[PDB]
Assembly symmetry: C3
Homo-oligomer: 332 residues x 3
């Protein structure tokens, strides 16, 4: 059974076929690839873009999305095996996944880490659980990686450059400031897709403490080695932005401080200048700026940069709709 | 780009065309004016009638509604420009409106005031924001005016009197009691539509303190001057209800006390007798009673009056469904 | 006007016709029995299976479900008559039911007891209210009985035994442990349907205090007397499970302690061994095990029993989808 947990699990041919099916669904939004079909969108965290583009994607293709929010409307779920359920959890993923498997044809899941222990959050339990117990294809709507976002990003970039081949482009994934520590998911996905496309990735971040988990630093290397691109870590703003083509911002808490965020505020608070402004963007080769959103103005990007005609954020967001229909149409 | 923020923004011909398209959709509920189309219903406050009649209206016309609740499921939104977003808000209306503009064809928004400062609530920021940043038509689902409610009311009244011409009818918009201060939205809309239809409007309320904001008192005058109706403020119950044809109840907090509600409870608490009962209703010319709902029994209206065959509240409510399909079918 | 409040309100012929229409909808899930129609699913409590199978059932039949949650998104509702609504409730069921009656074609309601006074919870006020004030058929989605669950259970049992005639089968409805006291709804429904099918029902529970309300003990008797089955209460685990064919587990708080749960914890806490494990299940005539779900592992059933090929829980759950389409298709 094929799922869409990560882009890394897919061959470059399938990924490419996806982006093309996306480009296609963008010219003809209505279809019946999902006629009479349905998808259960399980959200364990907030969502605007994802929730809306899936529900509309299912509709536009003849299917129907059922949005569930364990804890709010649906009963809370347990993921640990053998555990004696006398706590907050009402049922186990083993039952829930099989039950959903009788109602729907596809299951999408969104579950951000708990931020209490990266050793535990990085195992990606929820997604793995759904994938194991579900008889229908499971789709990652973001956990510790955001694969759907990756494709919406890659398509927006290809559209911008008017070509599918993005090799030779200087890609700069940059950490950016945020009052609180956030999920590395989008960053891990930016790196994975940016290196997979064969670009010149530079992971700009404040201190070595902000470097992404090794899993993604290694996926990145394997991707570089096989796409003819390159990976490079930096801690100098100007040198990085220096004549770049693409600039992706994303704020995230330093993994080494997971569970012990107290002594991290003082650290991140002394780097608010990583904010993408006109200055950095100027140092770029007439580069394009984007962010996964929700983006906080004058904190991550400045009003100027967002209002800049070089910000392809809204196009990337809109592509979430097209790229996801490509994934569903494929998995069924 | 045409929106449906207020009925005042529309000509009497368009309004009339709307009510007729509504009367029409009431004879043939199913259609395809919205086939393959969709609408994002953004609620920043509770809703039963509105939420249900839009979601069903979109369905009945071949489209699809996506209900979003910023703060609950969707990320919380910021409306002030330039502000440095390091607070509760996760993204800005400038991004959200443009993003929705890529997914849906219509955007409905509901946002009651915050009741902390009328000077600020009366600017109608949220609706104005959506209208400014959105590339698709925006629909007011209630903020400081309730335009959709207006039309559902006007249609129910016309249906009752068996004619579209409501001139010469004695309309009495009356304040009514409620344990807590409420939005003037429906009252401002009752006045706006009642005077726009050319009726003999009497704004009955406890003390001059309860008179509606000048904006609506002036819209009302312009409407009277152009419809051949009349406007009149009263503080005497009996004299008002006196041989009236229509009676609309709506409880709202006194604007002069916005932000300082403490000294208002004692005031409103000494006017519970404004409750619409059989007595007042008797003093009317076999008048009809209605309320926008949700209505609290034995507080705003008495069990008797609600169960009275002269209460056209449920018909008005039901018309929300028909009148709104007329608005959507028009805006697309 | 016909509703689906309880299976007891229906003749054995109609029930049978239902299960057959369900078996039929299971072979052809898509249909148009509800084309252009809609149903308002009112939930006053959490739900996963119910919410999803109704929303999908409505879709699969050409209709559309509108999910409402009074208190969360919809305005909170009042059910007592004459009461002076100056409290938490914003509107009365008398208005709400009539309003919904203008938007939808069917109304489903879910409202668990409040657990403060069984004398009050057993009157089944909410469901009765909707049934009284609504002009469209009302459907019980669970209150103090779970009729939809009953049929999903009966169909799963018939499917298992490869026959519609379940007479002569030893059915054992067993109480099971749970950290907190729960609704007897499913138990009352298990008993009602198990005796209605003409099986040999044994209501196994800890102490006489755990025996179901008389209403259901009497419905049960009338059902036994008319189906040729039998009813029997037990307090001995082994003797009951002893060569049984079906075993249904369900945890519920003892009625005699409703409102005074403090002195019940110590009581239920000394019966955790009622948990359905391999041992009890072995003492059965190669029996089948099922539970309505959400089920807590190693508390109500053991991992073993749930993973056992004799657990028809997921099939019962899946049948909720088919049996409910039979009910809707019928009521319209
Ligand atoms: C279909 C069962 C619904 C409900 N169950 C609960 O409320 C138990 C929830 C839990 O154990 O968390 C009940 O007991 O009636
Ligand atoms: C697509 C991004 C989702 C999420 N973002 C947040 O949780 C930040 C929310 C905020 O700043 O309010 C994240 O960081 O992964
Ligand atoms: C259509 C009316 C919506 C809203 N009503 C309330 O917020 C009153 C709610 C209550 O009384 O519980 C208002 O006053 O504008």
């Amino acid at each position: 059974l094929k799922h869409f947990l990560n882009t890394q699990d897919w061959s470059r041919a399938e990924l490419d076929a996806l982006l093309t099916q996306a480009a296609l669904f963008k010219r003809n939004k209505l279809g019946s690839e999902l006629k009479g079909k349905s998808i259960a969108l399980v959200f364990f965290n907030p969502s605007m873009r994802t929730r809306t583009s899936f529900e509309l994607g299912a509709f536009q293709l003849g299917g129907h999305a059922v949005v569930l929010q364990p804890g709010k409307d649906a009963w809370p779920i347990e993921f640990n095996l053998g555990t004696v359920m006398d706590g907050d959890t009402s049922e186990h993923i083993a039952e829930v996944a099989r039950v959903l498997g009788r109602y729907v044809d596809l299951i999408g899941v969104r579950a951000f880490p708990k931020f209490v222990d990266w050793s535990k959050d990085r195992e990606d339990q929820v997604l793995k659980s759904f994938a194991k117990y579900s008889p229908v294809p499971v789709i990652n709507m973001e956990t510790i990686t955001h694969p759907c976002q990756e494709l919406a990003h890659a398509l927006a970039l290809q559209e911008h450059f008017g070509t599918p081949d993005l090799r030779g482009k200087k890609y700069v994934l940059t950490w950016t400031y945020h009052p609180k520590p956030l999920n590395t998911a989008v960053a891990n996905s930016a790196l994975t897709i940016a290196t997979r496309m064969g670009m010149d990735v530079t992971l700009l971040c404040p201190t070595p403490d902000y470097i992404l988990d090794e899993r993604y630093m290694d996926w990145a290397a394997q991707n570089v080695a096989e796409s003819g691109g390159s990976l490079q870590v930096s801690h100098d703003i100007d040198s990085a932005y220096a004549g770049a083509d693409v600039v992706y911002a994303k704020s995230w808490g330093a993994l080494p401080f997971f569970g012990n965020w107290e002594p991290e505020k003082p650290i991140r608070d002394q780097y608010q200048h990583f904010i993408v402004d006109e200055r950095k963007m100027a140092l770029t080769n007439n580069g394009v700026f984007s962010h996964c959103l929700p983006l906080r103005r004058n904190v991550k990007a400045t009003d100027a940069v967002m209002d800049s005609p070089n910000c392809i954020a809204i196009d990337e967001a809109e592509n979430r709709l097209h790229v996801q229909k490509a994934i569903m149409a494929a998995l069924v």
